[PDB]
Amino acid sequence: KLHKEPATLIKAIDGDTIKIMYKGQPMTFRLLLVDTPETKHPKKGVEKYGPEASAFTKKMVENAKKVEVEFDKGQRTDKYGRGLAYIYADGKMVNEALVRQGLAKVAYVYKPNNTHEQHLRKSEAQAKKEKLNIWS
């Protein structure tokens, strides 16, 4: 049974990466299960809808009263030392909102970190049917 923990926004870095104060330490978090187009991508640089995905995440977490982190059941950091979690802004999952808006695709999924996978794929299929953004 996953649980949400309180956290404090430090800085939004990209569509799918946010810096957060967690249990009193600054950490970089990568959003589980979603790929957004990047502004800070290794190879390509600024890909299409990258600035848009990035502004969406930033506004969403910046305007929130409460930010919460929810770890999944498997590893909680990746090889870059980034936390792996679902992020909530006033009760709303940022990972899903991005997917629902056609601003992210559901990522390659790795068990056992796949608890909300079905839910996200359902939102992804709706944004495609609606031909939003990435899917337009």
**Token duo for residue 60:** 């969403």
**Token duo for residue 125:** 């299929």
Determine phi and psi for 97, rounding to 5 degrees: -60, -45
CA–CA distance, 73 with 85 (Å, rounded to integer): 10
CA–CA distance, 60 with 69 (Å, rounded to integer): 14
- Altogether, the residues listed in the chain come to a count of 136
Mark out the alpha helices in the chain (DSSP H runs): 50-62, 94-100, 117-129
Q: What is the DSSP letter of 55?
A: H
**Catalytic residue positions, numbered:** 30, 38, 82
| Resolution expressed in Å | 1.8
Determine phi and psi for 10, rounding to 5 degrees: -105, -65
CA–CA distance, 101 with 62 (Å, rounded to integer): 18
* Triad 69, 71, 73: Cα angle to 5°: 165
Tell me how the structure was determined. Answer: X-ray
Q: Is the dihedral of CA 44, 47, 93, 132 positive or negative?
A: negative
What architecture does CATH give domain 1-136?
Beta Barrel (2.40)
For the chain, which residues make up each domain, given as ranges?
Answer: 1-136
